Amino acid sequence: ASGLVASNLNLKPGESLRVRGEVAPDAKSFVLNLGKDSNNLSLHFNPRFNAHGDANTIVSNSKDGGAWGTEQREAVFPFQPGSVAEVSITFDQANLTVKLPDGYEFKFPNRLNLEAINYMAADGDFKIKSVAFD
Amino acid sequence: ASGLVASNLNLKPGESLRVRGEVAPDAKSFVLNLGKDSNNLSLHFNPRFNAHGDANTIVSNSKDGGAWGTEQREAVFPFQPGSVAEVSITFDQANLTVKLPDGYEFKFPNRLNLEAINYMAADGDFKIKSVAFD
Ligand SMILES: OC[C@H]1O[C@@H](O[C@H]2[C@H](O)[C@@H](O)[C@H](O)O[C@@H]2CO)[C@H](O)[C@@H](O)[C@H]1O
């Protein structure tokens, strides 16, 4: 990926990942990917400030064998350009749980039926400051 | 080895990398590698409890183009199996500065003179719990 890439994570069901970073000042959006590898993603977390027709909307999706799944969009957008963003993601067998900066939480189905998350990657618009595992 | 592996870290001169991890309860030693890739390590940080003929000794080395350099041993050992340990690493063109769990810090020559440190890898005896950039 463009930003920080972490592998061999072996994040098991019930375990979580907390990521804090800085969103590019001139970023139309940023990405945090979680999955098995670059082509198999359980969660493509993509807050869009202004991209692909989306204005301030969180878009989430899966990627199987390189093929994008069906997108999911949220009703809140607790992110501000050129600022710090902290998200926590919990992996579980049925669903991944995402907790946002405003306290809002949502779930995304574990479509790939992964037994663990071994891959994480941020793009060029999200500069990671810290990553923690509980 | 089998621990967490990170790439595209983009650690720049003067920037601090804080790594906190769990030292395996049965560990005879553990490793934290930092550099460009598996064949080019600015720092092979290897605390040894009882391994390779050494006892409770911190051994550091570099690896350039695959070749191991001259090992450096520290005069203190603030580590123990089955416990959490945090180390901080910073660097300039001349040396890398490594700060240990108790506040003790030493310098290791920057033998590879990399523009930035982009790779990190822990072995099976050091379970990384957190990585932070300052
Ligand atoms: O699904 C994530 C994926 O979206 C791509 O953009 C989509 C867009 O979201 C959708 O509204 C449109 O119909 O198709 C586009 C092409 O897939 C992004 O380009 C890609 O980066 C991902 O973010």
Mutate to test the pocket of ligand 1, among A31, A34, A44, A68 (most ligand atoms within 8 A of CB): A68
Pick the residue whose CA is nearest to atom 16 on ligand 1. Answer: A52
Q: How many of the other CB atoms lie within 10 Å of CB of A66?
A: 9
* Method in brief: X-ray
Residue A87 — left, alpha, or beta (φ > 0 → left; ψ -120 to 50 → alpha)?
Answer: beta
A103 labelled ligand-binding: no
Find the A85 Cα to ligand 1 centroid distance in Å.
Answer: 22
CA distances from B20 to A24, A98, A132, B93 (A): 27, 24, 9, 25
Q: At CB < 8 Å, which residues of chain A contact B?
A: 1-9, 128-133
A52 lines ligand 1 (CB under 6 A): yes
**Cβ–Cβ < 8 Å for B28, B16:** no
Segments forming the whole domain that contains residue B115:
1-134
Pick the residue whose CA is nearest to atom 9 on ligand 1. Answer: A52
Which tokens belong to B78? 């603030």
Which tokens belong to B87? 């180390």
DSSP B12: P
Q: Can you tell me which atom of ligand 1 is nearest the CA of A48?
A: 23
> Which residues face A99 on adjacent strands?
A88, A105
Where residue B55 sits, what CATH number does that domain have?
2.60.120.200
> Which residues face A17 on adjacent strands?
A89, A133
Q: Tell me, in Å, the resolution of the deposited structure.
A: 1.9
CB-based contacts of A75: which residues, under 8 Å, 6+ apart? none
Q: Which residues of B touch A128 (CB under 8 A)?
A: 133
**Strand residues in B9-125 grouped as ranges (E):** 17-23, 32-37, 40-51, 54-64, 67-68, 72-73, 83-91, 95-99, 105-109, 119-122
CB neighbour burial string for B43-80, b if at least 16 within 10 angstroms, e if fewer: bbbbbbbebeebeebbbbbbbbeeeeeeeeebeebebe
Which tokens belong to A114? 């992964």
* Residue type (1 letter), A114: L
Q: Can you tell me which atom of ligand 1 is nearest the CA of A68?
A: 1
Which residue of A4, A119, A127 is the best one to mutate when testing the B interface, meaning the one whose CB has the most B CBs within 10 A? A4
Task: Report the number of distinct structural domains present in chain B.
Answer: 1
Q: Which residues of A touch B9 (CB under 8 A)?
A: 4
Pick the residue whose CA is nearest to atom 8 on ligand 1. Answer: A52
Sign of torsion over alpha carbons B9, A126, A14, A69: negative
Bridge-based pairing state of the strands A72-73 and A67-68: unpaired
Cα B73 from chain centroid (whole Å): 13
A36 lines ligand 1 (CB under 6 A): no
d(CA A43, CA A111): 9
DSSP B24: P
